[model samples]
Target: GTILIDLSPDDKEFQSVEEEMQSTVREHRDGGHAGGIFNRYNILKIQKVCNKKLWERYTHRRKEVSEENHNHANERMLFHGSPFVNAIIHKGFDERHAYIGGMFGAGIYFAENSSKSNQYVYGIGGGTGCPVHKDRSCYICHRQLLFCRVTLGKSFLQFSAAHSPPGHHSVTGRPSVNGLALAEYVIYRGEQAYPEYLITYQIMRPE
Candidate 1:
């Protein structure tokens, strides 16, 4: 990683702040083949929020809780934002390679550093586990879909989804393999969706 910017720790303003009070920090680093990646600032902001929440929950109760309890609490409380939640939307025309680069960078980060206890990623979806309607079924007999299961260091996370819809009807009154799309559409229309699951380390002490 290449350092793009460095905030001096020796600065008077930074030095005056208590270490325990500082929740997040940012640094730009070389992305190598990932090429000029620059989301550290945004990630740091999220980390600050997560850190503050963790501190608020555990600070006073530390002595009363066991390590296992602390770990479970952190795992249950960790938040995974939506795909477009933190998207850096640009106003101009989109560049394909740039978008690919960004995705590649994220994938690389997950492949390398994501195995650490403090990092995790996930995917979500829903569908039938077995065929409920044989004649009505278009494809995907079990309503199954594939996802990623990345285990890094002590942290392991699985991202999976099923593309099935309810109501037992088809678009244009014709059977189609659009169940997954329909599921997403219903979600867009404010229907109830499946819950997301998280898997990660209990605690991640910074190196």
Candidate 2:
């Protein structure tokens, strides 16, 4: 089971995470034209995920990998977007549910750029007001994004298809496909990540 702790707009932790996401999007926006989709999106709410079981599993695996490799296991906080946020909230990342033969290979994928992750998020209309900001009615059409703690653990960087390559616990590199040229990290096992925060946002049409 998991608990979603809503952070008030003024909460320090909320502001910190919000700034982190904002900076990521800002980088994408300054980099190229592909970031136009996120031009008007504003982070409306952030919820800290408290899933003891998932965290334990993820940390356990990270500890093992760190001890074996004599390093920090390359843990990172990455973005993941999906329509199945509810399911992932309870069960964690499941590669079985991921589409086969993605740009890198069949695995749970994550991105460093919020714009790249935003491509996968599917926002639907008709949700209730965001608990943190009911005054902001546009939260009804909220999109969700996950900030996950991933253990890269000796990553194998490549521009081609590969899954859990030898001597590496994860895959990462700038993708040649899609022409976006952003970094993506893929982990073959679900326990390699702990979905730490859930972000709810609204994408407004440019005025």
Candidate 3:
């Protein structure tokens, strides 16, 4: 059975995950799609997704592919920000409904920099103000992002939206191009990723 468990801000898992994203934003500020130093956004909450079935499938596939590729299973904890949070948490990553004209090929995109992923998150807004509930005064603006475990296995550096190299499991878009200012990873198969955590954060104001 699958479950979404809300974690306290002081929770060990939440603290570590939040710090990881902050460090990523600080260290990789120079390599973002917008091309400038960016600060980490505020992480308000984190929800852990515990799906045993999905986890088993992803782990098996990762090990099997790693063995086939001579024990080279490159893995990374990445960020993927999207408005469709419910669907992703329930069903896992699906590239079929992804935008084909992305910097890389039509695939599920992941990134290392939190700032880059933050760009894709859509804020919950409606009408003239927060449509969340009856008490508008207590409403705070926020957005959601998926923190995933991605198996890149045999990654190929790509310059355009094209097929991955033969025997390659993923593609990292080269930043030389305008569209690829920030680094992006594209994986064709959804099973290669596990949506581990959902983070709700408030957008940080510009410096």
Model number with the top lDDT = 2
Decoy 2 TM-score against native: 0.81
lDDT, candidate 1, 1-207, per-residue tens: 111122245645233321311222221122211111222111111111122332332333332222424332121111222222122111111122121222112121211121111111112111221134321212222111101111111121222131112331111111144232111111111011111111211112233
Q: Write the per-residue lDDT of candidate 2 for residues 1-207, one digit (tens) a residue.
A: 899999999999898888767766533433323223344468888999998899899889999878767767888989987668889989998877776765676788888877667656642221223445432233246778899899998888787423588888998866564554468889988889999999988755546
The alpha-carbon lDDT assigned to residue 76 of candidate 1 equals 16
TM-scores across all candidates? 0.17, 0.81, 0.78
lDDT, model 2, position 43: 83
**lDDT of predicted model 2:** 0.74
Model 3: colliding residue pairs: 33-182
Task: Please give the distance, in angstroms, between residue 15's alpha carbon in candidate 2 and its true position after superposition.
Answer: 1.1
- Which parts of model 1 have CA positions greater than 4 angstroms off? 1-47, 50-54, 67-123, 126-207
Candidate 3 Cα deviation (angstroms), residue 48:
1.2
Q: Cα lDDT of all candidates, in order?
A: 0.20, 0.74, 0.72
> What lDDT score goes with residue 97 in model 3?
69
- Which window of 10 residues has the lowest lDDT sum in candidate 1? 182-191
Q: Which whole-number lDDT from 0 to 100 does residue 35 have in model 2?
A: 25
Better of 1 and 3 by lDDT: 3
Q: Between candidates 1 and 3, which one is better according to TM-score?
A: 3
